[PDB]
Design a protein around this nucleic acid. Sequence first.
RNA 1: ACCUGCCGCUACCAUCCGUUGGAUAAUGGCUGAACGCCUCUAAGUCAGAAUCCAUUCUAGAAAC
RNA 2: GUUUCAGGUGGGGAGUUUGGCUGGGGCGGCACAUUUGUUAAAAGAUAACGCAAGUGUCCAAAGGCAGGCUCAGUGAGAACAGAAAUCUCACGUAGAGUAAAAGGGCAAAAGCCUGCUUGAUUCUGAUUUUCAGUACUAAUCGGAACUGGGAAACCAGGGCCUAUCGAUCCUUUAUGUGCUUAAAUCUUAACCCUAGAGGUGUCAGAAAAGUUACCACAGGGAUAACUGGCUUGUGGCAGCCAAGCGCUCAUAGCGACGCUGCUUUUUGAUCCUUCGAUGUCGGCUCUUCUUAUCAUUGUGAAGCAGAAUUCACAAAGUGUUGGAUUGUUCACCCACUAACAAGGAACGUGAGCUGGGUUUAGACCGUCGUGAGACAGGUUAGUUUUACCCUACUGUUGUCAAUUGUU
RNA 3: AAUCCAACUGUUUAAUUAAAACAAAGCAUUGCGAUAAGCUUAAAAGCUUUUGACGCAAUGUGAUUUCUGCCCAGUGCUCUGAAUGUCAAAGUGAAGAGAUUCAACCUAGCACGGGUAAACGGCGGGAGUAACUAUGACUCUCUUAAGGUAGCCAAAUGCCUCGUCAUCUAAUUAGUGACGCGCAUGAAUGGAUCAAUGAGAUUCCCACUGUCCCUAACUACUAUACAGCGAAACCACUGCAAGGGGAACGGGCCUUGCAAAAACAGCGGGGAAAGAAGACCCUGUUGAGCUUGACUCUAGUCUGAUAUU
RNA 4: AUUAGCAGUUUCGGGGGCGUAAUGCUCUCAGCUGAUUCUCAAACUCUGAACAUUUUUGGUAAGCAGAACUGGCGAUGUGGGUUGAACCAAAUAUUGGGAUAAGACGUCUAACAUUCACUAAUAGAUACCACAAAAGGUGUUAGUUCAUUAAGACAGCAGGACGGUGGCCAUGGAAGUCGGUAUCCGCUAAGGAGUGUGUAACAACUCACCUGCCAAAUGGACUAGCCCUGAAAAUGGAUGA
Lengths: 217, 250
Amino acid sequence: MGRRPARCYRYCKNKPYIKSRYCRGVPDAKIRIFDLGRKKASTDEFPLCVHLISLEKEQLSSEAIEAGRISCNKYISKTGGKDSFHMRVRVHPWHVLRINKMLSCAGADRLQTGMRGAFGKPMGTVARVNIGQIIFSIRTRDNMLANVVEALRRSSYKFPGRQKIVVSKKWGFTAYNREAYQKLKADGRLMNDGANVKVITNHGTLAQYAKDIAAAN
Amino acid sequence: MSIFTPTNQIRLTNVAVVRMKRAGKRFEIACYKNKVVGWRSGVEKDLDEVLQTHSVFVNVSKGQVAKKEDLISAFGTDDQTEICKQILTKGEVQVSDKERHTQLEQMFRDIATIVADKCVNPETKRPYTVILIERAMKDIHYSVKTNKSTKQQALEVIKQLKEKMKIERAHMRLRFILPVNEGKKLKEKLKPLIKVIESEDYGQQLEIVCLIDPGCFREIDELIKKETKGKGSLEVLNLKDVEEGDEKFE
RNA sequence: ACCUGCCGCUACCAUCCGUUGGAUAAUGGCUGAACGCCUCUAAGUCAGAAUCCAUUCUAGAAAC
RNA sequence: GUUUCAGGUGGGGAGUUUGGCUGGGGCGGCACAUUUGUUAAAAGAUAACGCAAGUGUCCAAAGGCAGGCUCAGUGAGAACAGAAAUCUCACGUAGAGUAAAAGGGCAAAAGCCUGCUUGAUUCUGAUUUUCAGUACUAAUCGGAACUGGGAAACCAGGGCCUAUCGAUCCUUUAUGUGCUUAAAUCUUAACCCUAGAGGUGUCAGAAAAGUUACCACAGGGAUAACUGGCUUGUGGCAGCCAAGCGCUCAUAGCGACGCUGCUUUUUGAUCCUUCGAUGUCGGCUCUUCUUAUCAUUGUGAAGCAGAAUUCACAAAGUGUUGGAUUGUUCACCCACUAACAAGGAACGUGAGCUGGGUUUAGACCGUCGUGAGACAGGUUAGUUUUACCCUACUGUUGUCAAUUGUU
RNA sequence: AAUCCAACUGUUUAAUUAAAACAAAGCAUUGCGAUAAGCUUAAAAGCUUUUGACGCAAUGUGAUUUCUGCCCAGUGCUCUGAAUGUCAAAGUGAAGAGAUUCAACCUAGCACGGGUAAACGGCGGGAGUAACUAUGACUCUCUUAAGGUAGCCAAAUGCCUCGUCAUCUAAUUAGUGACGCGCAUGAAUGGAUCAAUGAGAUUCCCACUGUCCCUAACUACUAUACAGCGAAACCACUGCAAGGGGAACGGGCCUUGCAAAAACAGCGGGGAAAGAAGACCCUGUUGAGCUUGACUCUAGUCUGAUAUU
RNA sequence: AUUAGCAGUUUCGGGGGCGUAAUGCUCUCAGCUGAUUCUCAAACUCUGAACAUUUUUGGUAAGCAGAACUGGCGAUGUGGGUUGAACCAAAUAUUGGGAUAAGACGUCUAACAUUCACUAAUAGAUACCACAAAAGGUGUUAGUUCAUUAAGACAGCAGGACGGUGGCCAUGGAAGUCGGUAUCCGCUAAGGAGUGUGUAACAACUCACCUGCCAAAUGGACUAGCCCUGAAAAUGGAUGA
């Protein structure tokens, strides 16, 4: 951060303070943009998924997150075409850090505005995670994987703590593996909504797929 | 100790005071010498980044905090946000050395940039020589004060340039509109006073007499020709001082 | 009091005197594997600082 | 004039005050009485100058009760009329409204609308909330009188609920064919008995301004200033990653955005030790010490042809200056130089120094203050005491009595 | 070589301050014509008065020189002032059996209205505006009346500040000249200058070069012994150090380094050395001295009435 | 609270070729609405938990300040943690023998044997507790993955590593290789319009690619154990020695 070195905002403690109807001086987060690459690209056209995940519960800064994203931004021509690229982070710095400032910076002793009423003005906006919660995600085609992991590698340095990279067996941003996510197309009971999927509704819906047929189109 | 007590005085002075004299009462803010300056000429950072203390005193040195009531009385506001901002914008700052230097430089530039109109050209032109004006400013030993305005300083410097010596300069083109037969008379009168060119003689029409008059004593000059003439008339001007004509020794 | 002024004490305000062996560091190698090659290295070892320790020098142990 | 009394004047004097909390104290704010929500770790209970807000009021209705009705919002229509007026019908388990803060509660209502009323009336008993099971604030339940509402059940101790307040005395007001005035029983007048209002906001209740650098006392390390202790935001110093700079070229030399560190040579946070006194700052003096090596030596790099630099290592063995200015470190120029590198050591060193500052009494100026007086505002003058003790150290005697022959 | 200050001559803190402080003549104001002024005393009675305005009593300034700009809004001080308000006690009336109660009339003072600034003091903030060319002359407005005039200045007065420019220097946070929208200068709170003077504050140059470069020499208390001469000193215990942990810098504790009687003369590194139940600081429902439009009071005073009268 | 595209649209917002601007076609924007997804809220919830430790508030943090439960120095030391107000063992009348506790068992210092692995480091060695990180390492140990291999490998060395062709560009020139693009085929076991070095540029060499020989294992990528790097501060120096 700017007023601090992120050593006092390394570890999760105190209950969550946020950008609220109680706080208000709360600054704007360092990124409000969380995707990178073809967001038009389909659920189906990209079937490759890697995650970034912490191993320790730690408060990643918004600035840090931004930095991480702009590794994977630049590792894209090196990768090969932004077309074959998605990203989403999946950790938004909702929570805000307090700073009681030390009024003395070149001299002058308080004991009057010392540690009395010494409650932080909110400066710092930050995200909490645990021992496996995701902190970057990349959907892509099965071409780039040694590229994306290297981008992640860069990202790993831009983040506090021991991270980890796991390749999901899913098609990227989906709760189905591949063994499943051909049977949906193959049997033809899938239903598409752009970047997402839906699936037809039998054990999904029943009271509204009782005397219904429009639910098999 | 004994009798020998480490006092070392009240609390360290080490920041810009911003003294605002509102409701006859002094309110002040812990900032920095440069930061305040930056704020007040464009660089709007954060309100508590430019302020090392986001609160208001009455005496920054002695470590005294004002009464909310006083603030209310003076400013008609309680929240320190607004009050602080006000203080920042319209209270007496303490500049650094660097800032002071910058200010000085600015002043210097604007007593050669304002004097670029009445510039010091060599034997022939070579019409601008603004660098040479700047150079000349301290060769005479001049107090380039940042208290006074630029225009005033310009006026001062030209008088000295006379006793440099290289003569005072301030010439433009006054195109005097002169009706009836007294115009001719006026023309005759003012020919030894200043230069006369682009003339015409008319009894049934206006006379466009173009003169080369003093520019830094121009209004006064304008006033004393009409009176001489007798009748009321119009005498147009340029802007203040221009370098269209000769500025070598003139 | 002043000018000289001895012995004496003293002033880079004068003069004379303040060394040389092994051991290493970094580092440069040598042979040389682990790892058919290759590598200052793992075994092994060459050179090598104002360094290290001795030599020289002061004191001289309830030490001989 | 003099008594004798009265009205004003009256810091000329007299006596006395001048809250409390408090990450020293004052400046500050109120966390000093009370409410809601969270702090509060699934009954209660449970703190800070913890966070977000409120309270000293407002209401003949914004109370009581009965009856009727349904709101916010949206849709589709409809002279003027469109984004808005008003008129329909649709949907609308509330997204409205309900004195206000916030949370709750609430639809044949707790809302809106009407109607009638004044249970916002009195006597008495119990409880709760806080709690000492004391007071008060508040609130609850049950009765007796007397009323109100509505057919009637029912509901009606003020506001849907949780806040919207206050002892004794002294007064003042109501209450009663009231009591008592103790040497003529009467008349008042007074006091009482009963219940209210006057208000204390420090809110279970200190009539109440300043200052002392002319000060004093009992105390306090519970409580500041120098020291050390934790800490390391801040200060310095170090990395890690590598987008970019660098003609070319990420890492020769740098290195954005970002992350991890050390450090106790900045200052703050702190108040553990010292107020029955560690002599406060600086400079002279002097040792010793650490390396984060400025020079030196031996080396490795380079964008290293040479000279000249730049970067790295080993390495603290030896060197690391003369001035001008300032109380001064810090600072800021000149001057030489191999280099003029960083620091420590009770911010090394006051029974080693001067005292230049800072810190008393005298004064001056400014500003502030009705003034006494204040001022990390300046200015000027302002006693640096004691070692003869223990040790440590310098040098010196003496001993070496089992360093063995009287030596 | 010149600056700051104070004119001088003089005086002061009975043991840190001799100063720029004080004083001082010179300048100015107020009070006052005796039963006066000012003051002393419970009382009686007094002093200045061995007095009478060319004076006494009370202030301020502070020699000379040259000046003292504006403001009576505030505070004080005064007044043969309008008032016809408030207004005590007494006295008057009314009412009530009385106690008692309620009306007028109403003193000073306050309120009010004028005077006063060499009495305290004050002497702006915003618009334009001498081509805003502008230092702000000038206009307009607002409060609290006036709105810093002449002078003067980073001054002993200026925070920012080592202000800017200039000189003086090899180099100058020092001095001095200039500038001066002056944090927060300024006209008897006295402003400006300056001869003479000053154990006065600052600087610069010549100034006899042991303050220093860098010390040495020599001459005088120490040391020794004699006497009176380990008085006084001393006092938890004592006194070897490295880290550790410890109420968080141990002489004692832990574990390490080590050490061998008795002594001498120097040293100031330690003994958180010694000298004071700390004054700095904060607490006490602890005090004092002084202040003031605190709370309460009081002599003195000004007025009213009874009585003497 | 808040991200993402997707769908139906919009003469009801706007601009392009067509069309009346178009909201119609073909593109993007704006707004609405419908289906999904991201992340989530001390002062929210449809739902729901039996001075020391654990919870927790403020604080950058502190041997800071402040709460909860319980436990501890008060008439509470002893044994242990080198030493110690809080940790353990565990409670203190005066004794003896026994057997344990915590903790140790080279020597200090009462207390030993065995057995297997690991480390080779001025290392490392009794929670609290007197420090260590991110990131590095062809140190050694363990382990997991997939791949290469008898069509004979790895590593090595030996041989070959051609033509259309100077492809097109830029370009006297840059022919695989200043630099750029397309990057295709013939013949072969075998050869990219080419990895570098180099050449003004070609070449030459080297690589990819293929065979000879030797003769059986090999290659990557992570994972975590110890060791190392990071890892500097002040009198000499502390796993207690």
